[PDB]
Design a protein around this ligand. Structure first.
Ligand SMILES: CC(C)CCC[C@@H](C)[C@H]1CC[C@H]2[C@@H]3CC=C4C[C@@H](O)CC[C@]4(C)[C@H]3CC[C@]12C
Ligand SMILES: CC(C)CCC[C@@H](C)[C@H]1CC[C@H]2[C@@H]3CC=C4C[C@@H](O)CC[C@]4(C)[C@H]3CC[C@]12C
Ligand SMILES: CC(C)CCC[C@@H](C)[C@H]1CC[C@H]2[C@@H]3CC=C4C[C@@H](O)CC[C@]4(C)[C@H]3CC[C@]12C
Ligand SMILES: CC(C)CCC[C@@H](C)[C@H]1CC[C@H]2[C@@H]3CC=C4C[C@@H](O)CC[C@]4(C)[C@H]3CC[C@]12C
Ligand SMILES: CCCCCCCC/C=C\CCCCCCCC(=O)OC[C@H](O)CO
Ligand SMILES: CCCCCCCC/C=C\CCCCCCCC(=O)OC[C@H](O)CO
Ligand SMILES: CCCCCCCC/C=C\CCCCCCCC(=O)OC[C@H](O)CO
Ligand SMILES: CCCCCCCC/C=C\CCCCCCCC(=O)OC[C@H](O)CO
Ligand SMILES: CCCCCCCC/C=C\CCCCCCCC(=O)OC[C@H](O)CO
Ligand SMILES: CCCCCCCC/C=C\CCCCCCCC(=O)OC[C@H](O)CO
Ligand SMILES: CCCCCCCC/C=C\CCCCCCCC(=O)OC[C@H](O)CO
Ligand SMILES: CCCCCCCC/C=C\CCCCCCCC(=O)OC[C@H](O)CO
Ligand SMILES: CCCCCCCC/C=C\CCCCCCCC(=O)OC[C@H](O)CO
Ligand SMILES: CCCCCCCC/C=C\CCCCCCCC(=O)OC[C@H](O)CO
Ligand SMILES: CCCCCCCC/C=C\CCCCCCCC(=O)OC[C@H](O)CO
Ligand SMILES: Nc1nnc(-c2ccc(O)c(Cl)c2)c(-c2ccccc2)n1
Ligand SMILES: CCCCCCCC/C=C\CCCCCCCC(=O)O
Ligand SMILES: CCCCCCCC/C=C\CCCCCCCC(=O)O
Ligand SMILES: CCCCCCCC/C=C\CCCCCCCC(=O)O
Ligand SMILES: CCCCCCCC/C=C\CCCCCCCC(=O)O
Ligand SMILES: CCCCCCCC/C=C\CCCCCCCC(=O)O
Ligand SMILES: CCCCCCCC/C=C\CCCCCCCC(=O)O
Ligand SMILES: CCCCCCCC/C=C\CCCCCCCC(=O)O
Ligand SMILES: CCCCCCCC/C=C\CCCCCCCC(=O)O
Ligand SMILES: CCCCCCCC/C=C\CCCCCCCC(=O)O
Ligand SMILES: CCCCCCCC/C=C\CCCCCCCC(=O)O
Ligand SMILES: CCCCCCCC/C=C\CCCCCCCC(=O)O
Ligand SMILES: [Cl-]
Ligand code: NA
Length: 388
């Protein structure tokens, strides 16, 4: 009752080739956009390009390799091992790029004053090169001896007419499942993804605190102004002014500096009048602070808030990319856990394996769409490339 295998194979192969074309076209566009637009040439987007390069190689190499290993063709076992393991290199490189992007965004939100001195393009290129070497080491670890080539399935090889030293080339026949679950999934995929989640939680928590701090200093500026107006002695004016002077410097950490120079100076003017017991003169001097607040301080408040909201928006776009990676790759890893941990369970059917593989490959298509829909500089650059 077995339908011809070439029928179901043709559907799987046709879908894979369609995904490969789309993965190449979209991510080549990403690389072409960063190359052309200097506004897109930053450390964050160098890891984006490294991530796009991995997705280009999914369509050029990993998908042709996946098509090849689905046939079970006769091959030298270590040759079969290489084409089976190469996708692990690309997946690992993607994980390193995703983790670097999250860390890069955390440095920008937590220590922006020393970000440009710490995170440079030259150091980013060196990190990218190191992560690619580690991705080959991790993904090709089975070629170092942790494989099933020492125990070939000779009955399957003889039935397919394979020569001596050859095996029917199938992923689960050469790559050990304990490597795939413990080493690749748990250690090399799950742990970095959980680290990324922790980094993004710290990014959004840091942004929420900084936006709260901005609003607290703005309220303290306006509350103590009311305290001075309804004060009854010079000591009460002095108490409210001392809190404003420290909060003004706390919020200060050309037109920006001039606005705060006026503010602290006007606070000092009113403070000197308060220390001399001149309540009415100190209150009138403190009323001049409202002119500085409307013309300078509120504009800084708004611009600083706008910058934080743009960093939140960019961190969400990056987190969506990392989340979609997890969504597309987790089914394959969960299936391997069932194969490995439940030998009394029937193996997941072949059609489900193909579907899980196609889903993982589709992740190499989605990133250019996230950039186009969420990052205006990419979207506008994409339009210029396509129109021209
Ligand atoms: C620079 C880039 C484009 C070169 C890509 C080289 C690829 C296509 C080459 C490099 C090593 C090759 C493999 C090496 C060994 C074997 C064992 C043999 O029994 C069947 C073919 C097989 C499995 C080869 C398939 C093709 C292969 C994967
Ligand atoms: C870009 C260039 C420098 C990459 C060079 C990669 C070369 C050195 C590597 C990549 C994969 C390797 C092959 C992978 C598997 C096998 C099958 C084994 O039964 C004999 C060796 C053979 C055929 C290897 C020979 C060396 C090989 C071809
Ligand atoms: C949100 C996403 C990541 C969740 C993905 C859940 C998927 C991968 C899970 C949900 C139910 C699972 C299946 C439940 C039962 C069986 C029967 C067993 O004999 C083989 C595995 C198999 C076929 C499982 C394979 C993996 C599976 C399809
Ligand atoms: C998504 C992140 C946060 C966690 C990943 C959850 C993974 C590791 C969990 C979710 C569901 C789990 C499976 C659920 C059911 C079974 C059947 C049992 O007979 C053996 C273990 C096995 C196969 C589990 C292995 C581990 C498993 C795949
Ligand atoms: C999503 C779109 C397609 C998923 C591709 C899944 C198609 C799976 C095809 C059926 C199958 O299992 O393949 C036949 C197999 O080769 C018999 O020997
Ligand atoms: C074996 C195969 C070898 C590699 C070929 C594979 C993918 C190529 C992807 C490389 C894309 C490089 C694009 C460069 C770029 O876009 O970066 C500009 C940079 O920001 C300026 O400062
Ligand atoms: C057989 C298999 C052969 C497969 C070949 C392996 C290719 C591997 C990695 C290419 C990596 C390319 C990644 C390029 C990122 C470039 C970049 O980010 O540029 C930084 C910029 O220079 C800052 O100044
Ligand atoms: C254009 C590309 C064509 C890919 C050609 C791929 C050739 C694959 C042959 C199909 C096949 O042999 O599948 C048998 C079935 O999967 C038993 O395991
Ligand atoms: C610009 C592109 C850059 C470079 C692009 C390279 C693309 C690689 C394509 C296919 C690899 C498939 C290779 C595996 C084919 C094996 C078939 C085979 O070997 O069959 C005889 C064997 O002895 C069984 O009995
Ligand atoms: C052991 C594996 C040896 C192969 C190393 C492949 C990585 C090489 C260059 C990454 C590109 C650097 C981007 C700048
Ligand atoms: C980085 C590490 C990649 C290690 C690369 C390993 C590629 C060589 C594996 C191999 O050639 O196997 C030897 C022999 O064929 C067995 O019979
Ligand atoms: C699975 C196999 C795992 C392999 C386990 C061992 C791998 C080595 C690990 C890291 C090397 C880190 C790179 C060190 C290269 C030198 C960097 C450097 O010189 O730069 C300092 C710089 O001045 C500051 O910006
Ligand atoms: C540098 C990493 C090591 C590079 C050398 C790896 C060669 C791997 C090899 O040839 O190993 C054959 C076999 O699988 C082992 O039992
Ligand atoms: C995050 C890390 C998850 C790592 C958790 C790894 C815990 C696995 C221990 C285990 O499951 O081993 C039991 C063995 O399977 C009994 O037959
Ligand atoms: C993070 C999750 C870590 C481990 C969950 C999976 C561990 C599953 C290990 C239990 C499997 C098992 O013990 O199988 C029993 C045996 O087949 C019948 O007696
Ligand atoms: N049992 C099993 N079978 N096939 C693959 C496989 C092979 C080639 C590919 O191109 C892709 Cl995407 C998947 C994986 C597998 C699972 C997780 C990570 C890497 C490979 N696991
Ligand atoms: C708008 C961009 C258009 C790009 C065209 C890409 C379309 C890809 C469609 C199908 C790929 C496979 C075609 C033939 C597969 C043969 C099936 C088989 O024999 O296994
Ligand atoms: C995914 C698909 C996006 C492809 C859009 C086509 C324009 C890109 C052309 C190119 O740069 O090579
Ligand atoms: C197959 C791999 C395809 C990767 C192509 C990536 C395209 C993006 C950048 C390539 C680098 C620049 C090459 C041509 C530059 C010419 C120019 O600047 O006018
Ligand atoms: C831009 C360069 C892209 C590379 C082009 C490769 C496209 C070919 C697609 C799939 C390769 C199929 C491998 C053949 C399977 C072997 C079948 C068998 O021998 O039994
Ligand atoms: C078989 C490999 C296993 C060990 C992995 C070694 C780690 C990577 C080794 C060399 C990477 C070379 C590039 C280093 C330059 C650093 C530049 C910089 O950080 O500023
Ligand atoms: C599994 C890892 C999950 C979460 C990591 C927790 C760290 C995040 C805490 C918020 C940061 C902070 O407020 O200091
Ligand atoms: C484990 C799964 C983790 C995250 C699920 C996907 C997160 C973002 C998906 C895109 C929609 C927002
Ligand atoms: C397995 C955990 C999934 C990892 C997703 C990381 C992205 C973080 C998303 C929202 C915060
Ligand atoms: C989306 C459509 C398919 C998605 C998931 C399929 C999961 C259920 C199939 C399990 C098959 C059970 C078995 O025969 O072992
Ligand atoms: C999403 C789509 C998942 C559906 C794939 C079903 C094809 C498998 C055929 C079958 O049930 O035997
Ligand atoms: C079979 C190819 C499926 C590719 C799906 C790519 C996901 C993005 C789709 C639409 C966004 C607009
Ligand atoms: Cl935007
Ligand atoms: Na990827």
């Amino acid at each position: 009752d077995g339908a011809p295998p070439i029928m179901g194979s043709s559907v799987y192969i046709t879908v894979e080739l369609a995904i490969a074309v789309l993965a190449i076209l979209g991510n080549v566009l990403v690389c072409w956009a960063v190359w052309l637009n200097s506004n897109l040439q930053n450390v964050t987007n160098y890891f984006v390009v490294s991530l796009a390069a991995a997705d280009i190689l999914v369509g050029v190499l990993a998908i042709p390799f996946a098509i090849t290993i689905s046939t079970g063709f006769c091959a030298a076992c270590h040759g079969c091992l290489f084409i089976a393991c190469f996708v692990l290199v690309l997946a690992q490189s993607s994980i390193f790029s995703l983790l670097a992007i999250a860390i890069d965004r955390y440095i920008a939100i937590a220590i922006p004053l020393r970000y440009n001195g710490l995170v440079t393009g030259t150091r980013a290129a060196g990190i990218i090169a190191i992560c690619w070497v580690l991705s080959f080491a991790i993904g090709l670890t089975p070629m170092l001896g942790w494989n099933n080539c020492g125990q070939p399935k000779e009955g399957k090889a003889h039935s397919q007419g394979c020569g001596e030293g050859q095996v029917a080339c199938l992923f689960e026949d050469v790559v050990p499942m304990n490597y795939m679950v413990y080493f690749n999934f748990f250690a090399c995929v799950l742990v970095p993804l959980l680290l990324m989640l922790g980094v993004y939680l710290r990014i959004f928590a840091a942004a929420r605190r900084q936006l709260a701090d901005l609003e607290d200093n703005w309220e303290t500026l306006n509350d103590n102004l009311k305290v001075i107006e309804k004060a009854d002695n010079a000591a009460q004016v002095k108490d409210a002014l001392t809190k404003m002077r420290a909060a003004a410097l706390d919020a200060q950490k050309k037109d920006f500096r001039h606005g705060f120079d006026i503010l602290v100076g006007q606070i000092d003017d009113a403070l000197k009048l308060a220390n001399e017991g001149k309540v009415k003169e100190a209150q009138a001097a403190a009323e001049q602070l409202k002119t500085t607040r409307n013309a300078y301080i509120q504009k800084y408040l708004e611009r600083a808030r706008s910058t934080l909201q743009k960093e939140v928006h960019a961190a969400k776009s990056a987190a969506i990319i990392a989340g979609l990676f997890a969504l597309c790759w987790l089914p394959l890893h969960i299936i391997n856990c069932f194969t490995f941990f439940c030998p009394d369970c029937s193996h997941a059917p072949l059609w489900l394996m193909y579907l899980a593989i196609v889903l993982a490959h589709t992740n190499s298509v989605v990133n250019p769409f996230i950039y186009a829909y969420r990052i205006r500089e990419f979207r506008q650059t994409f339009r210029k490339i396509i129109r021209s």
